[model samples]
Target: DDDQVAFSFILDNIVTQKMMAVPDSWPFHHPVNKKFVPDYYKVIVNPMDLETIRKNISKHKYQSRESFLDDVNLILANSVKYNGPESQYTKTAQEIVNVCYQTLTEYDEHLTQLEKDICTAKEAALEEAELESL
Candidate 1:
């Protein structure tokens, strides 16, 4: 859940913006199928990258949410600036997606476990701080 929260922040602010910048259509031809498909569509931001970013954020202690938000924005800017035909952009996005997917898959279970641990730690810290004031 915590990982998801972090992931959402990235997606809403960074990935979504980049995806919006990409054109909706491209030309594609299948060599084996011998067919030309016009107006092919693809997303600029892969879903998997969002997942990976979330997992990584979960593992780190961010001093401020703003720092994380800035990092996400930077990444989005970079992704959108990459130049090519629509299809090439699509392929590149897919590659980025794969990397994110693999990174997320590798760390998801650990992130989940760590989330629970962090919550517990936070509660303990709160109680200790309250006791110190009493």
Candidate 2:
């Protein structure tokens, strides 16, 4: 559970950075409705957004790193597909996707070292306590 919480913190930071990288016009902050984009659902079978990812984290919906990454990639890919490669939306999406990937790599390495230190320290203390008790 402690590890899961740590992982959640990493995810939270990533999402915050992602939201900051895009402007208000990025159009993937929240879910899209028919009135806003009539054919969006027809084109994008899986609609993903920053807000949706946030909600999922709050709801404890993400159990694996891969699942979270899938949604992150989906949000950008959906934009590129619907708006075309030449469109501004696609260009922005491509740019943000690069940022996302770069951030993810850094976070992954940070987490690996973090967990290694925390777990070993905790376990060492735990073993010492047990020995003293015995």
Candidate 3:
């Protein structure tokens, strides 16, 4: 449904914005730099970042939460793969990963609860109208 697609995009955007707001997330805002990391491409063939995810969200490229989450994980995995476990970039990547995942989970729960409340209220209103009509 259109609503489902729109909701997925909304969730993806929230995750992207949260990632961009993280401290030291500048390294992941854009694609990996070829000049800065000369051998980056040699090792990391499949690169990902917040910018790419943002574009994908705008384009409605992600069909499901799993697809969106896969991209998010790729950004962190690529950084850790290229920068080593103890590197500063890897540390920041992990932080972004943690924050975004938790944000996604929490926001999803909140939205679901909101929808439930709305449906309950809607049913109650319908019942009231039906009784008034009688």
Candidate 4:
């Protein structure tokens, strides 16, 4: 439907990254109560706060994608653990798996850019001087 896209139902409500509700339906959880949806997100409360564990944003300079993803994991780790849709410690392994699957393509976009250099193959735009001749 025009009103919906991938995960659009949740995407519309969330002004930021965190989910407000614990997803009770499929994809969020598995049958036989095997998996719960809250484990999908990391709800970092005041994540950028200077207290408790200091967030040295400046200190975090990403040299490589792996390092960047590691920091991403640390920041998002167990976000839903405390608040809404909170999951248990036992679910940690599955939760990590979920994150990896979710972001699978996001990290590989650089590869896509190389493979689909369609625009790079196109002729350069005519300069302003050429337009005057036309």
Candidate 5:
């Protein structure tokens, strides 16, 4: 369960631009669609991370772009499912940019309840002495 949530966070964030495709605003916002997702993945979705994935792909084929596209419906539907009075979809590119800057970037971290326990075991350790002592 903790693995799922943390993996969800990584898979949600880094693994695929936070389990992303179609730029989250493409269908009505920018000029984009399922057709545009692959290059978008290569170009926009962390070309850096792609090399590791693509290299692995060469030796063993992976999901097609369609799989990733299908998964977006998962992400969008979950947006409503997971959104709290606390969460939401970014309505526009500017809103996404603002939210990421203000709230949703990689600097933002999400952890499971057990991960919280793992954290608590160490007492938050946000204090500078924890790192400085290490």
Candidate 6:
């Protein structure tokens, strides 16, 4: 039950882009027949580019920041309505960017530690090499 719950939660939060491809068996082989499928069938009906999202956000008529955030959260949440594990695709580039921005901003302290560790390792290696050369 826990696993199922976790899986459902993850599925609920996914973002996906949908693109349609016509099979060879199609008579006309027109691209229009294909639909952009989001990660979750209900999230996005068709894949939209970043420019479209940005434009829509800018044009949104929300009166307050809270309202804007609420709208955004809903849009982002719905962007990847996961149908199930059997879904063919998941996540658009926009969704990836959203997830990364949220993670980095929310966990900046952890990220700082990671940066410090990386710098320390680099410095140590350089110092060791210099000592051996000298």
The candidate that wins on lDDT is 3
Model 3 misplaced regions, further than 4 Å: 1-5, 109-134
Please tell me which model should have the higher TM-score, number 1 or number 6.
1
- C-alpha lDDT of residue 56 in model 1: 52
Give the better candidate number (1 or 2) by lDDT: 2
lDDT of 3 by residue, 11-114 (tens): 66675678788987898999878999899899998999888888887776665557777998898889888888889999998998888777878667655654
Write the residue-wise lDDT of candidate 6 on 28-96 in tens digits: 112222354223334445433333333443453322223323433543344345333233222332344
- Give a tens-digit lDDT track for model 1, residues 1-107: 36446544544433334432334412111111224323222323322234444455565634233444455443434345434435464565544444434444554
In the range 1-134, model 4's lDDT, one tens digit per residue, is 12112222222222113221223212222212215535343443333111111122233232233433453354335334433334543244244434543554553664344323422432233454567688
* lDDT value, residue 30 of candidate 2: 76
Model 5 agreement with the true structure over 1-134: per-residue lDDT tens digits = 24333433433343334222325543322323448554444333322222333233344232222332243333334333333323534243233333323333443344334345544644555666678888
RMSD of model 5, in Å?
14.1
Worst 10 residues of 3 by lDDT: 1-10
> Superposing all C-alpha atoms, what RMSD in Å does each candidate have to the true structure?
13.8, 6.3, 8.9, 13.8, 14.1, 16.9
Runs of candidate 5 with Cα error greater than 4 angstroms are 1-61, 84-87, 90-134
Q: Judge candidate 4 at residue 86 and give its lDDT.
A: 46
**Alpha-carbon lDDT of model 3:** 0.77
Instruction: Report the candidate with higher lDDT, 5 versus 6.
Output: 6
Question: Could you say which candidate leads in TM-score?
Answer: 3
Q: How close is candidate 2 to the true structure, as a TM-score?
A: 0.71
TM per model? 0.37, 0.71, 0.73, 0.26, 0.22, 0.31
lDDT of 4: 0.33
Q: Can you tell me which runs of candidate 4 are displaced by over 4 Å?
A: 1-60, 72-87, 90-97, 111-134
